[PDB]
Amino acid sequence: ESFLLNLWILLCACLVLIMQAGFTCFESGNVRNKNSVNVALKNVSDFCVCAVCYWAFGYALMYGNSIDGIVGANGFFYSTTTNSHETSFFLFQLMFCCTSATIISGAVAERMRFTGYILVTLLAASLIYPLFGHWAWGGRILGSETSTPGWLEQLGFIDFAGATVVHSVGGWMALACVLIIGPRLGRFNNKHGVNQIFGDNLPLTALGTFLLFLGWFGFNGGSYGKIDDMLSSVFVNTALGGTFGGFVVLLICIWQQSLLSIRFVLNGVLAGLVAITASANSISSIDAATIGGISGALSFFATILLEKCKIDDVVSVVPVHLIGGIWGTLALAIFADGQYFIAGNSRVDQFLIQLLGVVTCGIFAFGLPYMLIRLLNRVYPLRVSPRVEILGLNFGEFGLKS
């Protein structure tokens, strides 16, 4: 009976929902207290907007029967099915759409206008996430007998749980947004001057990191597509990817004597988790440890590099979700068991199609949003006024009276 798998997917979707709690804590604690309420408002609003969009038409665009191969075109206002796994799958996939979009808020914090962020959320949920999703995962409908692969999927692109599909998409859109709104006031000065701006509730960011970690077990577990005796290995690999991402960054912080090491260590854990998201089902425990640990290190160096580039990513979305997601997606070709690849593929062939997916994601999730958000910003400024930035977005639109 379809019962055990349905129950499994539903519990995994519950775990994905706790990731939304995780992000709210992670982001809100990493900002100053004068912004922390606006952060909270962004994090509940995006969830509601994304869920409404995904239910109304995003699931249709992503998973419906492919019209030309670019997009799906049935499953609007999702309700009834003759596929007894589909409804569980739909709920789980709705939680992934919410995850991809909510990544963006942490990069743009402390100076993006609320309504501006919600419009970006609409673009993510309505167009960018479901269309890329179709291309990578369009054929991958749980319990379906009549599915057709998206075009990247058809070429052999592998992404077990969304290193590219969820995390890179969000990260590319975040990068676009921070380039357009610009750095916080007081972040960068002179030519090479960098000031750190620290959050006011870093303990809540640690809670948040643990909630994200917990949720990631559902994120990866619910993507497995079945139950067999190798499911527990996905969970070990998830644990090792996160813990080695953190451990490696802890070692680096001890070695470098890093200021506010906590932020780097937590980001290391998250980067480790993102990197194994592509391959949790296809690698050994040693390679999970390796891929996660490397991901952690990369997040550390990428944080430092973004600062040198005068790009202000408040919680390090790009180091964690984008650099981690790219690394994980390419790492799959280096480390995964080749039996998970198309029969006619070497590791070089697999590397090339993983790379094509990475580049395609970048062109569509960075290039198109960059152009569209730059256009929106010209007629509807996305950056708050200086007064609102200085007083804090708690005092912004829909907040407190100053």
Residues lying near ligand NH4 in the complex (CB under 6 A): 20, 23, 27, 43, 46-47, 102, 105-106
Q: Does 144 bind its own copies (CB under 8 A)?
A: no
Of 25 and 108, nearer to its own copies (C-beta) is 25
Q: Could you tell me where the DSSP H helices lie in 257-344?
A: 261-276, 285-308, 317, 323-335
Q: Which of 30, 45, 102, 316 binds its own copies (CB under 8 A)?
A: 45
Q: Which of 6, 24, 36, 38 binds Cl ion (CB under 5 A)?
A: 38
From the list its own copies, ligand NH4, Cl ion, none, partner contacted by residue 105 (C-beta under 5 to 8 A by kind): ligand NH4
Q: Does 339 bind its own copies (CB under 8 A)?
A: no
Give me 39's structure tokens: 């952060």
Is-contact 106 317, C-beta < 8 A? yes
Of 272 and 396, nearer to Cl ion (C-beta) is 396
Q: Left if phi > 0, otherwise alpha if psi is -120 to 50, otherwise beta: which for 399? A: beta
Is-contact 11 66, C-beta < 8 A? no
Distance from C-alpha of 353 to C-alpha of 218, rounded to nearest angstrom: 27
Place of tokens 């290190």: 297
Q: Which of residues 188-207 bind its own copies (CB under 8 A)?
A: 198, 201-207
Q: Does 114 bind Cl ion (CB under 5 A)?
A: yes
Q: Does 94 bind its own copies (CB under 8 A)?
A: yes
Of 59 and 117, nearer to ligand NH4 (C-beta) is 117
Q: Which of residues 46-85 bind its own copies (CB under 8 A)?
A: 47-49, 51-52, 55, 77-80, 84
Of 164 and 205, nearer to its own copies (C-beta) is 205
Q: Which of 35, 45, 168, 350 binds Cl ion (CB under 5 A)?
A: 35
Range in contact with Cl ion (rule: CB under 5 A) among 35-43, 122-130, 243-251, 341-349 = 35-43
Distances (CA, A) of 394 to 238, 312, 342: 36, 20, 52
Which helix (H) or strand (E) is 67 found in, with range? strand 66-67
Of 136 and 234, nearer to its own copies (C-beta) is 234
SS3 189: strand
Give me the least distance between CB of 109 and ligand NH4, in Å please: 9
Q: Does 109 bind Cl ion (CB under 5 A)?
A: yes
> Using the 8-state DSSP alphabet, how is residue 112 labeled?
B
From the list Cl ion, its own copies, ligand NH4, none, partner contacted by residue 113 (C-beta under 5 to 8 A by kind): Cl ion
Sign (positive or negative) of CA dihedral 218, 221, 227, 229: negative
Q: Does 257 bind its own copies (CB under 8 A)?
A: yes
Give me the least distance between CB of 377 and ligand NH4, in Å please: 20
Neighbours of 315 (CB within 10 A): 29
SS3 307: helix
**Cβ-closest residue to ligand NH4?**
102
Q: Does 93 bind Cl ion (CB under 5 A)?
A: no
CA dihedral 207, 212, 217, 219 (to 10 degrees): 160
Strand-pair partners of 71: 67
Residues 6+ apart with CB under 8 A from 225: 140, 142
From the list Cl ion, ligand NH4, its own copies, none, partner contacted by residue 206 (C-beta under 5 to 8 A by kind): its own copies
Q: Left if phi > 0, otherwise alpha if psi is -120 to 50, otherwise beta: which for 197? A: beta
SS3 188: strand
Binding mask 215-254 vs its own copies (x if CB under 8 A, - otherwise)?
--xx--x-----xxx-xxx-xx--xx-xxx-xx--x--xx
Give me 117's structure tokens: 């962020």
Give me the least distance between CB of 47 and ligand NH4, in Å please: 4
Q: Which of residues 113-142 bind its own copies (CB under 8 A)?
A: 115
Place of tokens 């969820």: 166
Binding site for Cl ion (CB under 5 A): 35, 38-39, 109, 113-114, 393, 396-397
